[PDB]
Coordinates of N, CA, C and O (backbone and C1' of nucleotides) in Angstrom, one line a residue:
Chain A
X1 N 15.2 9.9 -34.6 CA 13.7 9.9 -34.4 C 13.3 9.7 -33.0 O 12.2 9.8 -32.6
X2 N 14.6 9.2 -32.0 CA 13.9 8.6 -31.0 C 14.3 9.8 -29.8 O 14.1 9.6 -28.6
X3 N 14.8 11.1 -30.4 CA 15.4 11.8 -29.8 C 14.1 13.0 -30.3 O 13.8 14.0 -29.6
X4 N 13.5 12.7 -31.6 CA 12.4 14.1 -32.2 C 10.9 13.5 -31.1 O 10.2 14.2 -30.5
X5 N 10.9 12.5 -31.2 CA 9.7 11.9 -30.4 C 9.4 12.4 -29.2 O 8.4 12.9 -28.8
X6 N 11.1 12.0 -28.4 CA 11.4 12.4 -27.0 C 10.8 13.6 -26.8 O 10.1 13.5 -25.9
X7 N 10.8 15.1 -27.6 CA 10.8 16.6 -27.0 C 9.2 16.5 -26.7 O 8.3 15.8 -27.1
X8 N 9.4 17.5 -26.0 CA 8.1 17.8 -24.9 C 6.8 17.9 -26.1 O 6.9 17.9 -27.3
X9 N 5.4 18.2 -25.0 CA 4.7 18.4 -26.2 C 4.5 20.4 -26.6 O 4.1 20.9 -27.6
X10 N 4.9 21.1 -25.7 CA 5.2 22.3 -25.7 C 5.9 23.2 -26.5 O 5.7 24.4 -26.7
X11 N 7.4 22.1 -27.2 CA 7.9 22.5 -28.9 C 6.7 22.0 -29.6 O 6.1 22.7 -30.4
X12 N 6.3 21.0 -29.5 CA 5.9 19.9 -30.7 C 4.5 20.7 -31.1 O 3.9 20.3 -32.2
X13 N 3.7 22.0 -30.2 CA 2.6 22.3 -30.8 C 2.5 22.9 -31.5 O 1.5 23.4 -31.8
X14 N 3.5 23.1 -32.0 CA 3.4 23.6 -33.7 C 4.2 22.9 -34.6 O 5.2 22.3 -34.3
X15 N 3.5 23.0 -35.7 CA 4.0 22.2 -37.1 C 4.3 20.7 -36.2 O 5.3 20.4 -35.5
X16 N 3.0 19.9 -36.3 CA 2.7 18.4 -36.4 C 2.9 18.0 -37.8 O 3.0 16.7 -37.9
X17 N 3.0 18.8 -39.0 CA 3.6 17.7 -40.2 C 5.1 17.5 -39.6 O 5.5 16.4 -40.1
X18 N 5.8 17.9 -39.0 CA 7.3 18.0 -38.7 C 7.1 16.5 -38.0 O 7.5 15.5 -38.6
X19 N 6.6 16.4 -37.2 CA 6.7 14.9 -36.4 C 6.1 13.7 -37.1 O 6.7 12.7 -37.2
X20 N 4.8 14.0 -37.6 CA 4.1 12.9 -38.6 C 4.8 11.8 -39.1 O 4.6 10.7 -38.8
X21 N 5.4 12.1 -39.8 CA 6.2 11.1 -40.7 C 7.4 10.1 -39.2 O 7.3 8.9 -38.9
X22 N 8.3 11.0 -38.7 CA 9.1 10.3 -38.1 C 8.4 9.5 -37.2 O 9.2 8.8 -36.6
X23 N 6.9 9.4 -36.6 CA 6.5 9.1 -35.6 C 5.7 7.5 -36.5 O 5.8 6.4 -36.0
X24 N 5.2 7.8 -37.5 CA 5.0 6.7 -38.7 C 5.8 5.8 -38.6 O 5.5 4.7 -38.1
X25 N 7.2 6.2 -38.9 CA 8.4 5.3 -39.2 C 8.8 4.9 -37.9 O 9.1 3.7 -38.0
X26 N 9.0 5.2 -36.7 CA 9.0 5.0 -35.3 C 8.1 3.7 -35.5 O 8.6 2.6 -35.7
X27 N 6.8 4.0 -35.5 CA 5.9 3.1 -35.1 C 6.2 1.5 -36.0 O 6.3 0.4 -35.4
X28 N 6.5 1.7 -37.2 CA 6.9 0.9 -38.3 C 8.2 0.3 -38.2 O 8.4 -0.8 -38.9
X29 N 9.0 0.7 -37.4 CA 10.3 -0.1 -37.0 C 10.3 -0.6 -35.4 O 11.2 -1.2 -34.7
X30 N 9.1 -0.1 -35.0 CA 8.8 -1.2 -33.8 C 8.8 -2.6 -34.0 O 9.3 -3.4 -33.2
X31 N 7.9 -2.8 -35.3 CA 8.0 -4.5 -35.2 C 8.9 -5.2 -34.9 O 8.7 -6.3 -34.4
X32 N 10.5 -4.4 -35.4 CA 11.7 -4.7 -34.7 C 12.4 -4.6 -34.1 O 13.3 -5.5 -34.0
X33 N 12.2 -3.1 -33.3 CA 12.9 -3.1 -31.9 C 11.6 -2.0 -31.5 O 11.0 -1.0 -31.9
X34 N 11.6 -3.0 -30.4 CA 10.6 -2.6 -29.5 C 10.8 -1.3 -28.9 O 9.9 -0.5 -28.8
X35 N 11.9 -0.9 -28.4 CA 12.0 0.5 -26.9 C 11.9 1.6 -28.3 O 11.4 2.6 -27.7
X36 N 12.0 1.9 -29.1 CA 11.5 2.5 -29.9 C 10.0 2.8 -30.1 O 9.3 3.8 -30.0
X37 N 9.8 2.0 -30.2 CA 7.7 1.6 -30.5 C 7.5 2.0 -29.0 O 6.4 2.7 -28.8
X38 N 8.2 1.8 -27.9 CA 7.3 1.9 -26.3 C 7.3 3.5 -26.5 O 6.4 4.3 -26.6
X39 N 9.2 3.7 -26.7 CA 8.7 5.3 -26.6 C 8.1 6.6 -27.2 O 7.9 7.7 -26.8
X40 N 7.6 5.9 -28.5 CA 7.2 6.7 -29.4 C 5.5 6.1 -29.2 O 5.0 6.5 -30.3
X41 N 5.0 5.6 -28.8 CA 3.7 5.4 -28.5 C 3.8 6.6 -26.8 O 3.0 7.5 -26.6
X42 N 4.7 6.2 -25.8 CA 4.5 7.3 -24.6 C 4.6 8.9 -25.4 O 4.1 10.0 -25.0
X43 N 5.1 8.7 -26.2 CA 5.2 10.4 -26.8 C 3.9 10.7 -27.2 O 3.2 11.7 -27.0
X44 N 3.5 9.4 -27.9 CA 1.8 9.6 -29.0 C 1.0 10.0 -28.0 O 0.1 10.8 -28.1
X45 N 1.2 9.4 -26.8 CA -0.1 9.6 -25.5 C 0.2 10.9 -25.0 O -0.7 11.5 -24.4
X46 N 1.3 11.4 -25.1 CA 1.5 12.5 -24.1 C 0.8 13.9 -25.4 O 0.2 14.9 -25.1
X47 N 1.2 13.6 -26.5 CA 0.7 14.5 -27.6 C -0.4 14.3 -27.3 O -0.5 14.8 -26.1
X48 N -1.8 13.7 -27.8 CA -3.0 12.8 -27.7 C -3.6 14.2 -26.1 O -4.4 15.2 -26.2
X49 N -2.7 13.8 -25.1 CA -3.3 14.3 -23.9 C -2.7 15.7 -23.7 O -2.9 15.9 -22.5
X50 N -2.3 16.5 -24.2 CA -1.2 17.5 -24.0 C -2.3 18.9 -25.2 O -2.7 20.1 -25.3
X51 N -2.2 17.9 -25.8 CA -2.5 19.0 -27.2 C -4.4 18.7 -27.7 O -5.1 17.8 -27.3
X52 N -4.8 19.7 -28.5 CA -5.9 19.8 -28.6 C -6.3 18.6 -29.8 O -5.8 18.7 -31.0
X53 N -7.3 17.7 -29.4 CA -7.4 16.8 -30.3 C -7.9 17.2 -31.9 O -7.9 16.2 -32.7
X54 N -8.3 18.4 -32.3 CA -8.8 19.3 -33.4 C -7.6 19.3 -34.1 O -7.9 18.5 -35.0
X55 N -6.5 19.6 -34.1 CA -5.2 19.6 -34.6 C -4.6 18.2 -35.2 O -3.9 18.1 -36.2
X56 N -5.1 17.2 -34.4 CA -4.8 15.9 -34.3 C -5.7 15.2 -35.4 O -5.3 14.2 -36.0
X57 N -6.8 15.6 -35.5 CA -7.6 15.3 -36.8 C -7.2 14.6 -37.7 O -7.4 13.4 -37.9
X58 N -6.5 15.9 -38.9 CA -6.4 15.4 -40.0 C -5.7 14.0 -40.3 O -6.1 13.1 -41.1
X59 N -4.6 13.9 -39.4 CA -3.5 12.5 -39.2 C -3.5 11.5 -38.8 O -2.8 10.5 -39.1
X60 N -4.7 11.9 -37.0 CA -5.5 10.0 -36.8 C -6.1 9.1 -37.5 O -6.5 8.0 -37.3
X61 N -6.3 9.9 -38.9 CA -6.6 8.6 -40.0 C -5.2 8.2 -40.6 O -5.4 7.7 -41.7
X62 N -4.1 8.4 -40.3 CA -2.8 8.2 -40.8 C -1.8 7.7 -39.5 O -0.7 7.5 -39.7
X63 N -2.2 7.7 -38.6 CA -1.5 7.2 -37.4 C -1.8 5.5 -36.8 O -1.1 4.5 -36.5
X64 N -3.2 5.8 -36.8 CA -4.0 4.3 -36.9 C -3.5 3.3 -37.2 O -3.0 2.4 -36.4
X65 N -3.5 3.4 -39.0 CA -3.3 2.4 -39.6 C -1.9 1.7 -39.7 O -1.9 0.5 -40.2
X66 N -1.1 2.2 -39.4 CA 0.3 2.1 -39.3 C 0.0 1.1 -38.0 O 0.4 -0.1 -38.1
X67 N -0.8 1.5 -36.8 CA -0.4 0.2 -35.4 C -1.6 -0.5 -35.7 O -2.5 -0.8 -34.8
X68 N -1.7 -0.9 -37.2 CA -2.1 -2.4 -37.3 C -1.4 -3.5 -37.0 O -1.9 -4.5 -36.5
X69 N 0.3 -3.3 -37.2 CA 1.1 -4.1 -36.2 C 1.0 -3.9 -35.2 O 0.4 -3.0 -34.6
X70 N 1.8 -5.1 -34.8 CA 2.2 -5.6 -33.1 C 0.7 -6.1 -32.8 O 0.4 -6.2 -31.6
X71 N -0.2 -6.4 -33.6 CA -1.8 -7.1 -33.1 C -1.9 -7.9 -34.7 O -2.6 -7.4 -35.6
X72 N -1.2 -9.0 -35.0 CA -1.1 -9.8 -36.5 C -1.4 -11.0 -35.4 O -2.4 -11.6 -35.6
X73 N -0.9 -11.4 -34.6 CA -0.6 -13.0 -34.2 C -1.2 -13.6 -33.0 O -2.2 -13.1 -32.5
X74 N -0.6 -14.6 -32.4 CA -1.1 -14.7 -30.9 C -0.5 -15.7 -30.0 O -0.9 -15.8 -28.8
X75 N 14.5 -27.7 -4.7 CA 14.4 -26.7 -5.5 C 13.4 -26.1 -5.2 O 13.4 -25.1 -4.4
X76 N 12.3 -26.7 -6.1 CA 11.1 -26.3 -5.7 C 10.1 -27.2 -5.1 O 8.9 -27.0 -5.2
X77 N 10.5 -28.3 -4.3 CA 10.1 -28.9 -3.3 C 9.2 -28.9 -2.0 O 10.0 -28.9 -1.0
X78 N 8.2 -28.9 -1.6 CA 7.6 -29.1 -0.7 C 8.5 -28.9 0.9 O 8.0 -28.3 1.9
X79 N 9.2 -29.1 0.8 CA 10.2 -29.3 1.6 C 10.3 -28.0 2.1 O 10.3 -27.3 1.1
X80 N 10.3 -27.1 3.4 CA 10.6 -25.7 3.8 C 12.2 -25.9 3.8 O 13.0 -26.4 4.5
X81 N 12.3 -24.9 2.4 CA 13.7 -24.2 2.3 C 13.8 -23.2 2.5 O 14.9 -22.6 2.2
X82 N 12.7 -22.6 3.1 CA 12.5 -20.7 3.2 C 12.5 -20.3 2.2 O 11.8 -19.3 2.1
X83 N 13.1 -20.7 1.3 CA 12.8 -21.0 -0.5 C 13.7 -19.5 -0.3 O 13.1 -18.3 -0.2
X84 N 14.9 -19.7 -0.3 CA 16.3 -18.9 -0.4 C 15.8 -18.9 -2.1 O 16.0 -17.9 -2.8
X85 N 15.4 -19.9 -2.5 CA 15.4 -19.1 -4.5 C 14.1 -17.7 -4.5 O 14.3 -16.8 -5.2
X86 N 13.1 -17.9 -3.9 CA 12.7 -16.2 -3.8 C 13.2 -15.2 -3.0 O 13.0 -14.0 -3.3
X87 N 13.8 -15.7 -2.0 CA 14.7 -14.6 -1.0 C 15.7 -13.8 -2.0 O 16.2 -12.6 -2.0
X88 N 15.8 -14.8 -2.7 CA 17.5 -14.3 -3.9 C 17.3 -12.7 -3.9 O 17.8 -11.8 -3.1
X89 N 16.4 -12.6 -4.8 CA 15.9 -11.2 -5.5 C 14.8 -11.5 -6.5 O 14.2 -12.5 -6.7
X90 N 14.5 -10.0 -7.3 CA 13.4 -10.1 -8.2 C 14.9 -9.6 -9.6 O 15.8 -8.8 -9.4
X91 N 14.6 -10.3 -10.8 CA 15.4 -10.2 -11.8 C 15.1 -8.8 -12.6 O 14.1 -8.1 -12.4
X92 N 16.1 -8.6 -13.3 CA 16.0 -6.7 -13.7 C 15.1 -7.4 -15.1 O 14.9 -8.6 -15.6
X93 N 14.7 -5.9 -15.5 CA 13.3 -5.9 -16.0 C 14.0 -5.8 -17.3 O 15.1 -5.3 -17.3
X94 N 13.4 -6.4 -18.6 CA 13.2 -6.3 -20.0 C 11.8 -5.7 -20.4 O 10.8 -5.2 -19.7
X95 N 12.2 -5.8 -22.1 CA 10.9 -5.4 -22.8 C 10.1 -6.2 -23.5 O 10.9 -6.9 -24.1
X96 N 9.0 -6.4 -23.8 CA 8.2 -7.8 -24.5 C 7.4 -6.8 -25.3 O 7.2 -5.6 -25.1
X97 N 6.9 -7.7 -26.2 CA 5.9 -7.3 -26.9 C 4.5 -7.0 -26.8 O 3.7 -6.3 -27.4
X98 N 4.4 -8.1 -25.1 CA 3.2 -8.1 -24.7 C 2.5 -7.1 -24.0 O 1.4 -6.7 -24.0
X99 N 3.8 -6.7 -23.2 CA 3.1 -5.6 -22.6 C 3.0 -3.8 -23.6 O 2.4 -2.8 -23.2
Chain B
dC1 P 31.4 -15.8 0.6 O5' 30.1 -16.7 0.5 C5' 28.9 -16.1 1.0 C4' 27.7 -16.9 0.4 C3' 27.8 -17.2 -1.1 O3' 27.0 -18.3 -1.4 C1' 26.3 -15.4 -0.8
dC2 P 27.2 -19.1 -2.8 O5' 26.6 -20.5 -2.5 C5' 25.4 -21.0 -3.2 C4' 24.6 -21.8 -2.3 C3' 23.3 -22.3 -3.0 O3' 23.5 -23.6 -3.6 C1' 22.9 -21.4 -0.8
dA3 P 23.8 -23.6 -5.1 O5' 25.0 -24.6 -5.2 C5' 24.7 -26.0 -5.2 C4' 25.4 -26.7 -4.0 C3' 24.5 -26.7 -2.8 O3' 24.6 -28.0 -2.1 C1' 26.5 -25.6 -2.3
dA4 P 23.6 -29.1 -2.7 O5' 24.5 -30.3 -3.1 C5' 23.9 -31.6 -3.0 C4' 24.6 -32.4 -1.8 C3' 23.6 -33.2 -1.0 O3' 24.2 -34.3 -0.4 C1' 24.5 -31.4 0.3
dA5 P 23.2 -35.4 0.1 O5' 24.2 -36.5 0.8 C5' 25.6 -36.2 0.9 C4' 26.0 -36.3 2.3 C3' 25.1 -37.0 3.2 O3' 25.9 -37.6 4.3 C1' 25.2 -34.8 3.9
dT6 P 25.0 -38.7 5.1 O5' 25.1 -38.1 6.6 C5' 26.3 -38.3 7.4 C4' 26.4 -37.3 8.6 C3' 25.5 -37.7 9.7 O3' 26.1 -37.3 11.0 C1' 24.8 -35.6 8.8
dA7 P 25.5 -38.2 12.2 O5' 25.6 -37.3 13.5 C5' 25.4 -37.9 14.8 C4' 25.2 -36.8 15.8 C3' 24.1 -37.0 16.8 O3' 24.3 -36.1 17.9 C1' 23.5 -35.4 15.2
dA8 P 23.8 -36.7 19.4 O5' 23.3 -35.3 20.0 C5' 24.2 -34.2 20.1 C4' 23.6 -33.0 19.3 C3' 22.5 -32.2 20.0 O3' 22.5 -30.9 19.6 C1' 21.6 -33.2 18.1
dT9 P 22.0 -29.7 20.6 O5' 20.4 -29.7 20.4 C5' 19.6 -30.3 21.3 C4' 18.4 -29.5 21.7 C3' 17.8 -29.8 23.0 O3' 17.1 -28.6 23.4 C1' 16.5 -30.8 21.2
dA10 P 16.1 -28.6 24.6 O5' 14.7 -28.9 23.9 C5' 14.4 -28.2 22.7 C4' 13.2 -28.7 22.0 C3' 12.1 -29.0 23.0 O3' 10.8 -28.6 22.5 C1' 12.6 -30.9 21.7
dG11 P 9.5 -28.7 23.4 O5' 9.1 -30.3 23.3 C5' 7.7 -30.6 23.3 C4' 7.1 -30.4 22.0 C3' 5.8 -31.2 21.7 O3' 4.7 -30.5 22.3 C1' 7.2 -31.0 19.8
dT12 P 3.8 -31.3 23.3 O5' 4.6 -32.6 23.6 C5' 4.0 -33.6 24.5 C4' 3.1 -34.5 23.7 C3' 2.5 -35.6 24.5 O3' 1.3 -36.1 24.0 C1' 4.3 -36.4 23.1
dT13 P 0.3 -36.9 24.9 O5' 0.9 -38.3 25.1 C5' 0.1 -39.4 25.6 C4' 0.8 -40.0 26.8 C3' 0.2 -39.7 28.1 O3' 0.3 -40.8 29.0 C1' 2.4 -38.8 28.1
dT14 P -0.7 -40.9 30.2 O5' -0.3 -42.3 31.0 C5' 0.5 -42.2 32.2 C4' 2.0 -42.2 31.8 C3' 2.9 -41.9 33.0 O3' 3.2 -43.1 33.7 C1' 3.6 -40.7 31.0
dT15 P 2.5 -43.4 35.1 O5' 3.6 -43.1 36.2 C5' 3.5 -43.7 37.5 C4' 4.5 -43.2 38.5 C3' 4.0 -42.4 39.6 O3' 5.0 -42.1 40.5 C1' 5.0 -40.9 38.1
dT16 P 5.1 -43.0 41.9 O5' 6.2 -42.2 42.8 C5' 7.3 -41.6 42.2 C4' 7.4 -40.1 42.3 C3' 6.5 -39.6 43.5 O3' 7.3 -38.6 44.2 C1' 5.9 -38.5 41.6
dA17 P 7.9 -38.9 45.7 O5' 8.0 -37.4 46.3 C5' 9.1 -36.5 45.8 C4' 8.5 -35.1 45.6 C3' 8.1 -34.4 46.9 O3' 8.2 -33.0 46.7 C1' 6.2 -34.8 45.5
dG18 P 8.3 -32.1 48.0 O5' 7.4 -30.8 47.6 C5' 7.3 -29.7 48.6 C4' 6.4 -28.6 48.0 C3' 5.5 -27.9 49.1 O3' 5.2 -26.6 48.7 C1' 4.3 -29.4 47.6
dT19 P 4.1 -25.7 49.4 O5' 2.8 -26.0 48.6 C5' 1.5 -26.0 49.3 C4' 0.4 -26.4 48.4 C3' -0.8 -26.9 49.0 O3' -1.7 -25.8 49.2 C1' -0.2 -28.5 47.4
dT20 P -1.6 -24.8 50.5 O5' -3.0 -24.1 50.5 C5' -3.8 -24.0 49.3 C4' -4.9 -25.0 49.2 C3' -5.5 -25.3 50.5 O3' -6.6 -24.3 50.8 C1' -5.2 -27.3 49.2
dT21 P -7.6 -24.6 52.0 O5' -8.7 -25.4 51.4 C5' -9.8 -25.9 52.2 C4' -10.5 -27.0 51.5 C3' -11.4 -27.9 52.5 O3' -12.3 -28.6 51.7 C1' -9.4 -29.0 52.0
dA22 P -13.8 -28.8 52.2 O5' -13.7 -28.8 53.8 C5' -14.8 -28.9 54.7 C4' -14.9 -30.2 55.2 C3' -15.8 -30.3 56.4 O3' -16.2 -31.7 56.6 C1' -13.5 -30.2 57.1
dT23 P -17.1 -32.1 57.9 O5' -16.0 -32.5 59.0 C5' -16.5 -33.0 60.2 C4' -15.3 -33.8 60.9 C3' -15.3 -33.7 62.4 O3' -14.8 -34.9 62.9 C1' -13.4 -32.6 61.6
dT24 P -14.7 -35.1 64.5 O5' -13.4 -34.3 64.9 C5' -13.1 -34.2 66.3 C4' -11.7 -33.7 66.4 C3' -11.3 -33.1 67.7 O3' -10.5 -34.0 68.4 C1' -10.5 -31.8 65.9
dG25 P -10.6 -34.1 70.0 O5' -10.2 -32.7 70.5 C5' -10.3 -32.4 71.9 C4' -10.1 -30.9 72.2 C3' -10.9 -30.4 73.4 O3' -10.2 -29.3 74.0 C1' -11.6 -29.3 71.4
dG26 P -10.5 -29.0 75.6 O5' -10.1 -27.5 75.7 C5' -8.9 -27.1 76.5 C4' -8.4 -25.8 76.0 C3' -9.3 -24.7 76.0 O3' -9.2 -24.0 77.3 C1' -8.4 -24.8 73.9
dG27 P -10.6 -23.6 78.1 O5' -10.4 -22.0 78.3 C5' -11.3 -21.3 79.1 C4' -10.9 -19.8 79.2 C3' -12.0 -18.9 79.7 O3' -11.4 -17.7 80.3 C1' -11.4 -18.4 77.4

DNA sequence: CCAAATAATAGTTTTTAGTTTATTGGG
């Protein structure tokens, strides 16, 4: 699904029932892995902006309601060290929920 | 490739020695 999401929106403008469902279930197994849910929401935006929103109709009342989830809840001394601990680096990047 | 404990150099405000001036008396 995370490979049907991926394709451009240029296959994808025809037969939107073909993606519907896997893009559901994408969104639906985000609650538990996230890079899933990021990329299939970047897919939903690139569809959304790509494609004519007339088409998109009948199933934004079916896309919606599904991302009711993910919205349920809610050294270092004074001392000049040149602070060699920010000189280090900046740490490689993960994924959260929040953003 | 950071990992801590230790003397040096130089941030003061001190005197002193090259300074520059208005009165000197020469066609």
């Amino acid at each position: 699904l995370t490979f049907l999401l991926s394709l451009p929106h240029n296959i994808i403008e025809l037969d939107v029932r073909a993606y519907v469902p896997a893009l559901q279930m994408a969104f639906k197994l985000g609650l538990s892995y996230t890079p899933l849910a990021e990329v299939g929401l970047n897919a939903l935006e690139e569809w959304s902006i790509y494609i004519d929103r007339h088409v998109m109709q009948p199933y934004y009342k079916d896309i919606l309601p599904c991302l009711d989830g993910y919205l349920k809840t809610s050294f270092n001394k004074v001392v000049l060290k040149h602070l060699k601990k920010t000189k280090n680096l900046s740490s490689n990047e993960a994924i959260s929920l929040e953003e």
